[PDB]
Design a protein around this ligand. Structure first.
Ligand SMILES: [Cl-]
Ligand SMILES: [Cl-]
Ligand SMILES: [Cl-]
Ligand SMILES: [Cl-]
Ligand SMILES: [Cl-]
Ligand SMILES: [Cl-]
Ligand SMILES: [Cl-]
Ligand SMILES: [Cl-]
Ligand SMILES: [Cl-]
Ligand SMILES: [Cl-]
Lengths: 156, 156, 156, 156, 156, 156, 156, 156, 156, 156
């Protein structure tokens, strides 16, 4: 039977315990996700309290991180989502994504309505991935792909 | 000589005027940008107060939209950027992008640090674009590509 | 060509002008929506700046309310939605609905996950209606039906 | 003698404990409420700290979940209600209901005054329920019924 | 047909104009409410944007204050209520009432539940009045009576 | 020698402990205050962290509730007052009193100035009480009397 | 008959006009308050929207500043007080007084309770003055005297 | 070597422990500061976490209050100052001082600039004291003296 | 006679007008400050509402910008300082300086106390400047120097 | 493998433990950073939870402070940065840096744009140092050098 959380702090406390174990074992998110059949972004989100793992995935990552039974069960709970402490991130790495919305948020709205129509690009019927690539000018770039379903707003 | 703004309301009020003109002329953002040599996302952002147009582009869009000279000059000013009225978007279309950050913000942080290192993906050395792709299961998806330079944080 | 707003105040100022005209003519929302082919809640939301009207509906309500051409045009624009002045309504009538969420929000989440699964009940693929019904015990009740699509959250 | 709470955290801490037991026992809210004579929404709300259980119902759910006496007592206290952590929900599932208010809030006000008069639709003399209905276009919808008494505002 | 507002600033701007007229005519709130058949507190609240006046009351106070027709019509509209600029009053006179709630709010909850039961004392089925009385120790006291219906919260 | 608090959490935590003891003993506020010589609203406010008990009353209520010596001493401290968790109450029972201020705050100011003069009605030289009165139309009403000294603001 | 305001912006807009006139005439606050028989701090506060002037003083300052009749009447109204734009001052001069409260607020509470007892030092039965005194170490000091009545909090 | 704090809670938690000890020993702030050679306002502020005590004063107060060594060392640390829990005080005693700034803040700014010039009255080069004086009309007054260095803002 | 502002919007509106004139005349801040004898940072801050210009400097920049007499007079007023719209900058250029504080704020506190002692580095007895320096690895750097007087916090 | 944090409190609690140990050993930040091969400002920021130490540096500071293995591992994790408790510092020492931004933030924007162009001065490609220098007029100054890369914002 599906189970869900209502207070984010239970899963966020579990996340901190996970990260400590992870650091002690010197593991990567890539290797934790290996063998689950699931995308690195999805598994990582789950570890960090923002997705639920199916039972087999939770047992696998639980074994890798030496997690107790309560914790393996908690990982399967549908979370009370919201990773930002207090609305606006303080961390520079997180903040930059917020700044992309402060600069381009209204452009995204405008071009979504022009290209698709009234409605939204879904954060639910949705996937994301992160790739590292050389910058032709030197250094490296991230190519982060947001891939969401268009859900129309129609009159009724 | 470069000119800059300090009160976003001057360019945001201009944005509303531009949008009224645009609607009266039944024009698209694609057609406004066509001929400037600049990407639609850039030109659109400038119209909406989040980027500066070079003089020629300002005159070109100014002609298309029947703008006055003060408006054409304002478009060339470096803006006081920030398109969200009060931190958290109210508009569903815009909010969904904020929700992507509430769900994946910490994952983005975690995977940036694993793939690149300490530091940030830049919103300055940065571009984005929006593409419509057919969803195999029916309907349409938006593929939004965030493309940002990695700037490392190193000891000194 | 579709047109969209980025500052809610343009359509909110239009809403106030609409309401003054409505009052001067002593019209009801029921009578304004009649003949549009659209639900009273949808048309009303449009007048109040929270939905877009198709052109024929915009011209029709514009005739009833004696709106100028710019106003008729504005009603067809995709709005920057968000009716609540500052996050939490101050008006008692509006506040009661927010209180429903303060008492039942987490119950809604839990029951949605149990009955449907991980994911959301959509406010986009969505309809609302308000019915007045006599209370068997004396007085009147409102039956407000929220009717939203289930969109699942699945691993990837 | 009736007993009441003044700090929501006592009952919200209990809720988390309840949710862990419920998960360990692989129980549903449906099952837990069955046998109490109380609506599933009402019982679930009580477990989640937003309603008080009558003594018999508290003892019944208490047995199912293996709760200690103090917990069974706490379930019977009139709660300090307010399930949302910090005014605006972060969780997508809960947020969609807030968005319904951001889109339709002023419409609900307007149509309530039109249909009933000045005053409110009550969140106190109030029932809600969640029903799953097949969507003719495929998949599933939730029909959530908010059923509140009209309380008039009259001159005095 | 009943008419309602959605932007408090319209009626609050009218309140400021009413107050200037009132001061120029050197009128009291008691004199303005006189003849109206309505309580001083109700009529005053209406002038200040927090109640609607019945048509005859509006015309009567409109005559006293020399209001134009748009204003007499506005006073009949159901308001978007909320007199506090930004949640917490700055004005010492208003603040003291908020302080009463900071000191006694939980006591009022506790004693309402003990004396009446679960539920609320209504701010809708509600009367307020202010009396001036001598303090037996010297000076003067306000006796402010909050008279609200008990609305029970009952299981379902 | 008088003793005072600077952090409300110490007395608020004691209040939760007091309420758990009260509930285990199935005691009422009326019976806890009875015998102290102090008004029920005052004693209740003390228990809930918003007033100081004199030593004898502290020992009396401490015997009734089986409190330890540090707790009995804490009850005698002048509190750091403020019962509302985060400025605006979330609990419907407490919120209704806030709403009375959102509706009637400016009216209270205006009528206080008219009847008394510039200055305040004091929340310090102040008492309150709650009386249950039959509603002639059916049910029960609370008459809550706020009784405060007028303190004038005069030129100097 | 006493008259009062409910929106601070009316008197704050007047204050700005007063300050421009004052600057054009190169007047001091000392000389504006001369002849009024009132303290410079009181009269100045009135000009800046935080006190009411008696009629004679209003006419006198109105003459000196070339104010129109509506402005002279406005100066006589009891204000909606609150001079800080958004709770915490931005201006360094004003912020230093707020910092004094951030450093010494709890000390003030503690020493007030010890020296006087439970209750408050009043901001209403109150005066303040600003004196310049030479610093023996070089330069100048301000000695700002806050003089307020002790109002006791007593059991009842 | 000088030592400093960055999280206020460590010293605030210590303050609470100090206050319990103080109350158990029935001590006054006056008695605790006696023999330190330092002003009671300064010593009190230190105990409450807003100043650092010199080693000899820390040891003297620590013996009076039976503090452990870690506590005596903590009192000598330079604090992370800020005594107000959340910007605006909730406590009536502390709030009245914030209200003096809401009423007179701008007047203080204006008179400081007139009497001294551009710049600030310092909260750093600063002392305060609280004196009790009889009120001729009956009762007691607090004369609180804020004594700060004028620091000019000069062009460069 | 020195004159001061209490509402920042007056000078911030003037700043907008100045910037439009500056842009029309294609002027730089460097050339506007030239001839004034005042640092570029100081003059610029004045134009932007954050400093007061001496009379001669006001007349000089006024001539360059073609300002009217009221504008020249406003530039000499001591401002109500505070350039950030709502506490945290939205603009990326301004935000980075805030971020410097989020990362290094506690380090600045710690090192200031170590190097100097208890107290502050002054924002009043303060200057700043911005220099451009070539980056040895390519591109350009800004070396921004914050130069503030140490003011000690001493016991009393 | 690189390891990162997502909850600032883990490292902030570590910071507090570090500062206790540091105080018990009577150590300076200068001495702690000595031998590390890294700048005092960088090492200090790491201790305070705002930077990551390389392994050797972490082991060395760990030896000087007698940290346990978990603590030495935590120091190597990339932090969830953000040292300010709640956006605006309450501590006077930290606040003054924020005030610098309230006075000069817009000037910094304007001058950055003029001297470099559109874009930012980076807080990432960035170093900071604090130098104590005698003031020629008497006393001491801090010279705080902010040294950041210019990152241009270019059209595309
Ligand atoms: Cl990925
Ligand atoms: Cl695009
Ligand atoms: Cl249900
Ligand atoms: Cl009355
Ligand atoms: Cl307390
Ligand atoms: Cl009572
Ligand atoms: Cl004075
Ligand atoms: Cl003192
Ligand atoms: Cl200003
Ligand atoms: Cl410079």
């Amino acid at each position: 039977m599906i189970q869900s959380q209502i207070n984010r702090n239970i899963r966020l406390d579990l996340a901190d315990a996970i990260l400590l174990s992870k650091a002690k074992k010197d593991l990567s998110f890539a290797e934790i996700a290996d063998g689950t059949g699931l995308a690195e972004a999805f598994v990582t989100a789950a570890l960090l309290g923002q997705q639920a793992l199916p039972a087999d995935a939770a047992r696998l990552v639980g074994a890798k991180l030496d997690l107790d039974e309560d914790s393996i069960l908690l990982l399967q709970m549908i979370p009370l989502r919201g990773c930002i402490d207090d609305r606006i991130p303080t961390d520079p790495t997180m903040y930059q994504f917020y700044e992309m919305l402060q600069v381009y948020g209204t452009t995204l709205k405008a071009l979504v309505h022009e290209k698709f129509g009234d409605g939204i690009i879904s954060a639910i019927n949705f996937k994301l991935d992160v790739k590292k690539v050389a910058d032709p000018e030197g250094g490296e770039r991230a190519v982060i792909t947001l891939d969401g379903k268009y859900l129309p707003t129609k009159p009724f």
